[PDB]
Amino acid sequence: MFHGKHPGGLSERGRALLLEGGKALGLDLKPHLEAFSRLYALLQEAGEEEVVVKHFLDSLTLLRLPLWQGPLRVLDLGTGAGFPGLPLKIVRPELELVLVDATRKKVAFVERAIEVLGLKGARALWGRAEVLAREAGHREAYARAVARAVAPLCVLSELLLPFLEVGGAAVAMKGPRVEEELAPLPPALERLGGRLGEVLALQLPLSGEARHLVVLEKTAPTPPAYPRRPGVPERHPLC
Numbered sequence: 039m040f041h042g043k044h045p046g047g048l049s050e051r052g053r054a055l056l057l058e059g060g061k062a063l064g065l066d067l068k069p070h071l072e073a074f075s076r077l078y079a080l081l082q083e084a085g086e087e088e089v090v091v092k093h094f095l096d097s098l099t100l101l102r103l104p105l106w107q108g109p110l111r112v113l114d115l116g117t118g119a120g121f122p123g124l125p126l127k128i129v130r131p132e133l134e135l136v137l138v139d140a141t142r143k144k145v146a147f148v149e150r151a152i153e154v155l156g157l158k159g160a161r162a163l164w165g166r167a168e169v170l171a172r173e174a175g176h177r178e179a180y181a182r183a184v185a186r187a188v189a190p191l192c193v194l195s196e197l198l199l200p201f202l203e204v205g206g207a208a209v210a211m212k213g214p215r216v217e218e219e220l221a222p223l224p225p226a227l228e229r230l231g232g233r234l235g236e237v238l239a240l241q242l243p244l245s246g247e248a249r250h251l252v253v254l255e256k257t258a259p260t261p262p263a264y265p266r267r268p269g270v271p272e273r274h275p276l277c
């Protein structure tokens with residue numbers, strides 16, 4: 039089984055893995071298989087295959103939180119090549135997505151992926167969190183924000199919380215170990231106008247690796263001190 043190889047997208051095995059992984063997460067990815075295949079081809083144009091399929095599926099773990107209803111404005115901060123934002127947008131097309139990265143070439147890739155995949159209501163933006171979150175256009179202007187593989191929670195919270203309108207929520211996607219990053223966090227969240235929401239523990243569907251979705255709730259407006267200047271949160275974190 040799964041022997042088919044294709045020149046320009048996911049292999050027969052790659053397709054099967056994606057669908058199987060989706061089902062384990064409670065998702066039917068059949069309607070999106072060709073879009074994911076094309077996204078994979080784009081990533082290649084820019085064992086390999088299984089790694090990418092895993093990134094697709096890890097991104098899709100966001101859907102294990104009932105946070106994605108209707109046309110919410112969502113920031114994916116430090117999106118890189120578009121994770122977790124592009125998989126999320128593919129499967130939840132009503133979301134109004136802004137994907138930010140400090141690295142121009144990453145942003146250019148995401149912009150091309152949007153154009154090639156024909157996604158509507160998604161845009162890639164070259165910028166620094168610390169700068170954008172002081173613009174009236176972005177500060178406390180999002181209902182949701184997400185980030186994967188960006189920074190320790192103490193730093194990341196200062197980067198994410200100022201984008202959230204009061205009542206909004208952020209998801210910091212984390213790996214197997216969160217104990218140390220979480221320990222000193224709640225007082226720092228308070229300073230930013232946030233509260234710690236749930237920490238959802240889950241196991242990746244094909245690999246069985248542990249993951250944690252850390253939810254940050256936006257409860258009051260972020261004081262004007264935050265975020266501090268580019269690089270400062272990382273050099274002198276709040277916790």
Ligand SMILES: C[S@@+](CC[C@H](N)C(=O)[O-])C[C@H]1O[C@@H](n2cnc3c(N)ncnc32)[C@H](O)[C@@H]1O
Binds near residue numbers: 138139144
């Ligand atoms: C290790 S990559 C992870 C990318 C993607 N989220 C993923 O999971 O595959 C971290 C990315 O965040 C971006 N980044 C880090 N700090 C940032 C900041 N303060 N503002 C905007 N982008 C940032 C970097 O340019 C880099 O592309």
